[PDB]
Design an enzyme around this catalytic site. Structure first.
Site, PDB file in Angstrom:
ATOM      1  N   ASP A  34       0.868  -1.268   0.180  1.00  0.00           N
ATOM      2  CA  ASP A  34      -0.033   0.200   0.144  1.00  0.00           C
ATOM      3  C   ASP A  34       0.650   1.472  -0.040  1.00  0.00           C
ATOM      4  O   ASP A  34       0.272   2.306  -0.484  1.00  0.00           O
ATOM      5  CB  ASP A  34      -1.139   0.047   1.397  1.00  0.00           C
ATOM      6  CG  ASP A  34      -0.416  -0.495   2.696  1.00  0.00           C
ATOM      7  OD1 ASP A  34       0.821  -0.509   2.657  1.00  0.00           O
ATOM      8  OD2 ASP A  34      -1.174  -0.791   3.450  1.00  0.00           O
ATOM      9  N   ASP A 444       4.993   0.622  13.570  1.00  0.00           N
ATOM     10  CA  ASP A 444       4.353  -0.784  13.794  1.00  0.00           C
ATOM     11  C   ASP A 444       5.141  -1.790  14.267  1.00  0.00           C
ATOM     12  O   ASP A 444       4.569  -2.559  15.306  1.00  0.00           O
ATOM     13  CB  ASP A 444       3.747  -1.243  12.492  1.00  0.00           C
ATOM     14  CG  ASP A 444       2.716  -0.380  11.964  1.00  0.00           C
ATOM     15  OD1 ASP A 444       2.250   0.343  12.594  1.00  0.00           O
ATOM     16  OD2 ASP A 444       2.575  -0.187  10.500  1.00  0.00           O
TER      17      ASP A 444
END
Ligand SMILES: OC[C@H]1O[C@@H](O[C@H]2[C@@H](OC[C@H]3O[C@@H](O[C@H]4[C@H](O)[C@@H](O)[C@H](O[C@H]5[C@H](O)[C@@H](O)[C@H](O)O[C@@H]5CO)O[C@@H]4CO[C@H]4OC[C@@H](O)[C@H](O)[C@H]4O[C@@H]4O[C@H](CO)[C@H](O)[C@H](O)[C@H]4O)[C@H](O)[C@@H](O)[C@@H]3O[C@@H]3O[C@H](CO[C@H]4OC[C@@H](O)[C@H](O)[C@H]4O)[C@@H](O)[C@H](O)[C@H]3O)OC[C@@H](O)[C@@H]2O)[C@H](O)[C@@H](O)[C@H]1O
Ligand SMILES: OC[C@H]1O[C@@H](O)[C@H](O)[C@@H](O)[C@@H]1O[C@@H]1O[C@H](CO[C@H]2OC[C@@H](O)[C@H](O)[C@H]2O)[C@@H](O[C@@H]2O[C@H](CO[C@H]3OC[C@@H](O)[C@H](O)[C@H]3O)[C@@H](O[C@@H]3O[C@H](CO[C@H]4OC[C@@H](O)[C@H](O)[C@H]4O)[C@@H](O)[C@H](O)[C@H]3O)[C@H](O)[C@H]2O)[C@H](O)[C@H]1O
Ligand SMILES: [Cl-]
Ligand SMILES: [Cl-]
Ligand SMILES: [Cl-]
Length: 727
Positions: A34, A444
Site C-alpha cells: 500500500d 508498527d
C-alpha cells in the site's frame, strides 16, 4: 564512485494486501503493497524483488499499489494501478504503469482522478484486470464515483465505461472531515470468464464487483457493451473478491459487512453456478457464530473443487483459514475450539528466520505468539503447485509447501516467505561510533539494534515495547547510553539503555504525553530533553527520567537535538525560530530565525566532535527551502547557495585526506532531486543514488557511518532502511 544499494535486513514489517500468481507460467508471481511499491517473486532465491524503486520524490503517490495484473497471454507483461490517497494527502492523480519485462522498467499513463493504494478498501480486488483472450483489453475499477474504466490498447490510453450503471455507494465513515474514511469505495474487483472468448477476440462475459451492499455484483455478456446486476444475488454485504472456477463453472464471492482491511464483523460466502444462475450460501460458519467478514478467496487451478477463504478480520484468538475440497459443501479449518476456550491446531509455524515476529509478547491462551495471522485479505494457492499457498498479514507473508497434508489429516508447515520484501516506514536512524552499526526507529514494529546489517535482528525493542518509535539518540561520548521515545496507548513512551540498546528499561513520564515526539541525549549521557506529543511543554531530566521539569523558553512540540561535544548544550527548532540552552535544557532562549524556514518540516543535527556546529535542512514551497549551517551554536546560520531544497541531513566518516566529516542529504541540487554527498563541507555535491534508486519520499531521516567512508543509511516511507556503499 558507483554505489551499490541494498536494504538493512529486517524482512517485512507491514501490510501486504494482494498476492498474484501468473496463470500461464510456473513460479511467476508478484506482491503489491500500500505504500512501498510492488515485488516479483524469485523462486531460486525464495525472495522478493522490488520493482518500483525508480518512482521519484515528485511521484511518491505512485508507490501505493491498489491493484496489480500479470498478463496470462504474455507473461512478460505486468500492470499496476498506482496512487495512494483520494483526499488532499496525495496531490497527484493516479496512473496505470505498464511494463513488458516483468517489472524491470515501466511506462506510465496518468488517469484523470486519484487512486487509493493506502485508502480503506484496499484489500478488495483485484480491480485491474487483463482480458485473458485479447490481452490488449484492460479494465479498472475506480473509486470516489468514477465507476469503471477501460483500455483497448494494452493500457496506453484509458476512457470511462459510460454504460456501467453503478459506481458504488459504500462509505466507511461519512463524517470524517479529513476525507480519509469518507470516500466512496467504488468498483472493487473485475473477473473475466475466459471460456467466453477465443484467441484475439474479446472475452464476452465479465463479472464486476461493486462496493454497494444492495448491488455487489454486475455482469456483462456482450464484452462490456451492456451491464446488469446478477439476478438473485445476496444483499447486505460487500463482495471483497469474486473468483471463477472455470472447469466446474462456479463463481465464488467472499463478502463482509465492512470494506476492510481492519474492520469486518459479519460476512458470507456464496457460490454462483454460471450455467444455470443458481446461488448457494456456502459460508463456512453459521451467521450466529460469525464475528468477522470473509475474504482470502482462492481456487486450486489444478484441483477444481478445492478452494480456501479467510476470516480476514478475526482479531481473537487468531485469524481463521478455511478449506473445502467439494466446492463449498463442507469445510475444515486451520484451528478449532475443543473444550472452549482451548484449541486444536491443523498447522505448525516456524518464524526462526524472522524471529522478531513474536512481537515480544506473552499472550494469554488461547492466543499464541506468533499469530497465524491478521488482516488476511490476501490468500492464494499456487496455480502450478497444489501444495503451495501464500498469504499476507499486517506484518509479513506466510507460506507453506505441504498444503496437501491438510487433506490427509496431517498438519501443514508454515514459514515466512518475505525475504527481500522490505515494507517499514522509518522515522529515525543512528549509527554510533562504537557498538552496533545501526539503531532504527520504525512504524508498527518499534525498531531494532542492528548487530549485523545482513542478518534479521533477534527481537525488536522490548521492556518496554513501542508500537512505533519516533525518535532516538545516544550519548556521543558513550554510545552504551541510548534513549528512545515512541507511541503507545498508555505509558511508558520513553525508554533508556545502558548497554548500547541490547536491553532497555522505562522511565517516568511528564504531564499530558500522548505520543513520542522527539528526544535528545546529553553528550555525556547525564540527562535528556524530551519534547513529547500532546504535552503542553518541553521537559528535561537529569539521570534516567525519574524526575522531570519544564524546559522554559521553548515551545511545546519543537524539534530537539543535543550538542555532540558540550553536554550542557541543547537545541530546538520550531516554526522558523532556533532555540538554544546552555544549562542542560533547563532554560532555552530564541536565537536565530532570520532566513530560516518558517513553513513546513525541518531536520537538524549538531556535528560530532565540534561544539556549536549545526546543520539544518528543511522548509517547503510555501517559503524558504534548503540547507543551512551555523558554527556559532545557532546565533547565525548561513544558507548554502547551491542547494535549492533539502529535507534531511546527516554525517559520516571523512574521505581520505579530507578536513571535515562527509555530509549526506535528500535534496534538490542543480535541478535534480536525489541523495547527495559532500566531502568538502558543502562546497560541492555529488549525486550518489540514480534514477533507478529513488524510493519516493525520503524526507524522514539520513545518516552516514562514522566508521565506514562512503556508507549512507536512507530512511524510506514503506521500503525500509536503504543502505548505500561505494562499489
Ligand atoms: O508519513 C508520515 C509523515 O508524513 C509527512 O508528510 C509527507 C508524506 O505525507 C503523506 C501522508 O502520510 C500520512 O501518514 C501515512 C504514513 O505516511 C504511512 O507510512 C502509513 O502507512 C501504513 C500503512 O497504512 C499500513 O497498511 C502498513 O501496514 O504500515 C504503514 C506504516 O504504518 O499510513 C499513514 C496514514 O494512516 C492512515 O492511512 C492508512 C491506514 O492504515 C491508517 O489506519 C490511517 O491512520 C489513521 O490516520 C489518521 C491520520 O490523521 C488518524 O491519525 C487516525 O487516528 C489513524 O487511525 C499522513 O497522515 C498524512 O498527513 C500525509 O499527508 C501529508 O500531510 C502533510 C502535513 O499536513 C499537515 O501540515 C500542513 C497542513 O496544510 C495540513 O492541513 C496538515 O494536515 C502535508 O504537508 C502534505 O502535503 C500531505 O501530503 O509523504 C509525502 C510528503 O510530501 C509529505 O511531506 C508529514 O510531514 C510528517 O509530519 C509525518 O506525518
Ligand atoms: O484482548 C482483546 C481481544 O479479544 C476481544 O476482547 C476483542 O473483541 C478483540 O478485538 C481483541 O483483539 C484485539 O483487537 C484489536 C482490534 O480492535 C478493535 O477492533 C475490533 C472491535 O471489536 C474493538 O472494539 C476494537 O477495539 C487488535 O488491535 C489492532 O492490533 C493490530 C496489531 O496487533 C497485531 O500486531 C501485533 C501482534 O502482537 C498482535 O497479535 C496482532 O494482533 C493493529 O494492526 C496494525 O495496524 C497498523 C496501522 O495502525 C493504525 O491504523 C489502524 C488503527 O486501528 C491504529 O490505532 C493505528 O495505529 C498497520 O500499519 C499494521 O500493518 C497492522 O499490523 C491494529 O491497528 C489494531 O487495531 C488487537 O491486536 C487484538 O489483540
Ligand atoms: Cl543468501
Ligand atoms: Cl512433509
Ligand atoms: Cl515532521
Amino acid at each position: 564512485d558507483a554505489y551499490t544499494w541494498k536494504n538493512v535486513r529486517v524482512d517485512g514489517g507491514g501490510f501486504v494486501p494482494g498476492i498474484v500468481f501468473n496463470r500461464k507460467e510456473k513460479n511467476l508471481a508478484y506482491a503489491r503493497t500500500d505504500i512501498g511499491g510492488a515485488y516479483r517473486w524469485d523462486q531460486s532465491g525464495k525472495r522478493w524483488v522490488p520493482l518500483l524503486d525508480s518512482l521519484d520524490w515528485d511521484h511518491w503517490g505512485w508507490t501505493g499499489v491498489v491493484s496489480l495484473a500479470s498478463d496470462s497471454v504474455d507473461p512478460n507483461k505486468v500492470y499496476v494501478a498506482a496512487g495512494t490517497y483520494t483526499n488532499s494527502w496525495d496531490p497527484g492523480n493516479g496512473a496505470i504503469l505498464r511494463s513488458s519485462n516483468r517489472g524491470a522498467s515501466w511506462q506510465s499513463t496518468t488517469l484523470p482522478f486519484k487512486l487509493g493504494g493506502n485508502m480503506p478498501g484496499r484489500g478488495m480486488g483485484e480491480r485491474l484486470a487483463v482480458d485473458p483472450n485479447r490481452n490488449s483489453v484492460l479494465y479498472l475499477g475506480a473509486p470516489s464515483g468514477n465507476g469503471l474504466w477501460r483500455s483497448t490498447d494494452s493500457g496506453m490510453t484509458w476512457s470511462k465505461v459510460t454504460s456501467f450503471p453503478n459506481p458504488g455507494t459504500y462509505v466507511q465513515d461519512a463524517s470524517d472531515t479529513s476525507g480519509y474514511l469518507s470516500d466512496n469505495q467504488g468498483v472493487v474487483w473485475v473477473t473475466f470468464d475466459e471460456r467466453t472468448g477465443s484467441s484475439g477476440s474479446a472475452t464476452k462475459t465479465i463479472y464486476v464487483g461493486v462496493a454497494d451492499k444492495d448491488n455487489t455484483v454486475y455482469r456483462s455478456t456482450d464484452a462490456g457493451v451492456t451491464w446488469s446486476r446478477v439476478a438473485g444475488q445476496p444483499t447486505g454485504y460487500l463482495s471483497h473478491k469474486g473468483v471463477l472456477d472455470a472447469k466446474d463453472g462456479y463463481l465464488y464471492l467472499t463478502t463482509s459487512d465492512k470494506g476492510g482491511p481492519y474492520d469486518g464483523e459479519k460476512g458470507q460466502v456464496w457460490r454462483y453456478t454460471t450455467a444455470t444462475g443458481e446461488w448457494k450460501n456456502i459460508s463456512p460458519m453459521a451467521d450466529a457464530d460469525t464475528y468477522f467478514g470473509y475474504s482470502g478467496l482462492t481456487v486450486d487451478r489444478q484441483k477444481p473443487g478445492t478452494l480456501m477463504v479467510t476470516g480476514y478480520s478475526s482479531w481473537w484468538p487468531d485469524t481463521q483459514i478455511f478449506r473445502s475440497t467439494d466446492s463449498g459443501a463442507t469445510w475444515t479449518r486451520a484451528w478449532d475450539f475443543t473444550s472452549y476456550p482451548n484449541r486444536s491446531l491443523r498447522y505448525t509455524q516456524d518464524v526462526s528466520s524472522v524471529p522478531w515476529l513474536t512481537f515480544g509478547t506473552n499472550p494469554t491462551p488461547p492466543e499464541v505468539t506468533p499469530k497465524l495471522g491478521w488482516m488476511t485479505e490476501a490468500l492464494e494457492i499456487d496455480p502450478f503447485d497444489s501444495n503451495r499457498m501464500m498469504y499476507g498479514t499486517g506484518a509479513t507473508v506466510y507460506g507453506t509447501e505441504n498444503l496437501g497434508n491438510w487433506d490427509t489429516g496431517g498438519k501443514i508447515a508454515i514459514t515466512p516467505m518475505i525475504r527481500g520484501l522490505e515494507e517499514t516506514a522509518v522515522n529515525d536512524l543512528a549509527s554510533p561510533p562504537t557498538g552496533a552499526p545501526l539503531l532504527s526507529a520504525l512504524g508498527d514494529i518499534g525498531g531494532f539494534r542492528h548487530t549485523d546489517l545482513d542478518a534479521v535482528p533477534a527481537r525488536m525493542y522490548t521492556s518496554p515495547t513501542f508500537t512505533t518509535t519516533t525518535s532516538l539518540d545516544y550519548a556521543e561520548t558513550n554510545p552504551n547510553t541510548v534513549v528512545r521515545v515512541g507511541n503507545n496507548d498508555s505509558a511508558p513512551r520513553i525508554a533508556f539503555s545502558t548497554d548500547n540498546g541490547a536491553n532497555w528499561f522505562q522511565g517516568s513520564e511528564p504531564s499530558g504525553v500522548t505520543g513520542g515526539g522527539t528526544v535528545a541525549a546529553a553528550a555525556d549521557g547525564s540527562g535528556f530533553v524530551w519534547a513529547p506529543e500532546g504535552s503542553s511543554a518541553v521537559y528535561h531530566t537529569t539521570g534516567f527520567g525519574n524526575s522531570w521539569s519544564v524546559s522554559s523558553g521553548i515551545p511545546a512540540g519543537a524539534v530537539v537535538e543535543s550538542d555532540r561535544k558540550n553536554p550542557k548544550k541543547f537545541y530546538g527548532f520550531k516554526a522558523g525560530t532556533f532555540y538554544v540552552s546552555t544549562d542542560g535544557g533547563a532554560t532555552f532562549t530564541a536565537r536565530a530565525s532570520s532566513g530560516l524556514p518558517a513553513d513546513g518540516p525541518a531536520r537538524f543535527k549538531a556535528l560530532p566532535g565540534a561544539e556549536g556546529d549545526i546543520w539544518l535542512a528543511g522548509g517547503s514551497t510555501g517559503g524558504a527551502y534548503g540547507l543551512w549551517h551555523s558554527t556559532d551554536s545557532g546565533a547565525t546560520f548561513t544558507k548554502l547557495s547551491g542547494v535549492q531544497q533539502a529535507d534531511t541531513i546527516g554525517f559520516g566518516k571523512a574521505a581520505p585526506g579530507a578536513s571535515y566529516q562527509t555530509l549526506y542529504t535528500s535534496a534538490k541540487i542543480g535541478g535534480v532531486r536525489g541523495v547527495f554527498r559532500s566531502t568538502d563541507a558543502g562546497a560541492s555535491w555529488t549525486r550518489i543514488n540514480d534514477d533507478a534508486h529513488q524510493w519516493g519520499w525520503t524526507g524522514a531521516s539520513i545518516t552516514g557511518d562514522p566508521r565506514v567512508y562512503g556508507r549512507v543509511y536512507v530512511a524510506t516511507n514503506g521500503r525500509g532502511i536503504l543502505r548505500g556503499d561505494i562499489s
